[PDB]
């Protein structure tokens, strides 16, 4: 409950989430500028012309730069963990990174807190091992699961299966996004670089990729919010 960080951000809804399961554009808006204070796991806005008129849970968020905004520097887009993303401007490249720090740091914090653990280095760690096993265990049984279908006359049977390899294709790009979620969260503590965007994208599976395109974005911000969505 005590102020991690503070300062003044410009922000902007840039995805949301509102109906069912289906992330959309958000309605074109200005820039409104506010003083922000990140207070345990929840972003605090208040009216610079003045209690806070909005609140911003970022539980299990990601935050990510935006140097390419064109209007703008100092952009970076938080997409939290319902399917909603926020583009935020501050003042500066270091302040860019120092907030991502605090608030990948929050987000560490406030898990280890689910698993009731105080050593949350330790933690993230031992969860980020169990991803990367349940990645390698359910890609080896997806591949087992597509060889077999050439084998199965019965359309019943292979039906089936087909299923199981859809849902392990959903199951895989959650888990991939997971784990590049908790290596930033672990990075933000080590003060280690954030795991590569690019290799995450490579994961998005192909109903992923004709969603992006339907947003007209292709980002770690979109493919997270579309992933979220799912309650994913």
């Known amino acids: 409950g005590t102020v991690r960080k503070a300062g003044a951000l410009a922000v902007k809804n840039f995805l949301v989430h509102k109906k069912n399961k289906k992330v959309e554009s958000a309605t074109r808006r200005k820039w409104k500028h506010y003083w922000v204070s990140l207070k345990g796991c929840t972003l605090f806005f208040y009216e610079s012309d003045g209690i806070p008129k909005h609140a911003v849970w970022v539980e299990n968020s990601i935050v990510q730069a935006v140097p390419e905004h064109p209007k703008k520097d ?6 939290n963990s319902l399917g909603d993303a926020f583009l935020f401007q501050t003042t500066s490249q270091t302040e860019l990174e120092n907030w991502i720090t605090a608030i990948h740091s929050a987000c560490a914090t406030a ?3 689910h698993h009731h653990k105080e050593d949350t280095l330790r933690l993230l760690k031992s969860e980020i091992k169990k991803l990367e096993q349940k990645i390698d265990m359910d890609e080896k049984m997806k591949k087992m699961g597509e060889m077999q279908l050439s084998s ?4 019943k049977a292979a039906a089936t299966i087909l299923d199981q390899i859809f849902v392990w294709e959903q199951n ?3 888990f991939q996004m ?3 979620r908790f290596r930033c969260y672990l990075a933000s503590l080590q003060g280690g670089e954030l795991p590569n965007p690019k ?3 490579a994961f998005a599976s192909r109903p992923t990729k004709v969603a992006m395109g339907r ?4 980002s770690v911000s979109s493919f997270h919010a579309l992933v979220a969505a799912r309650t994913g």
């Open 74 to 79: 100092f952009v970076f887009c938080l997409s």
């Open 111 to 113: 898990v280890a807190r």
């Open 152 to 155: 199965v006359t019965d359309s």
């Open 172 to 174: 895989l790009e959650q």
């Open 178 to 180: 997971d784990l590049f």
């Open 199 to 201: 290799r995450l994208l």
């Open 215 to 218: 947003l007209g974005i292709f």
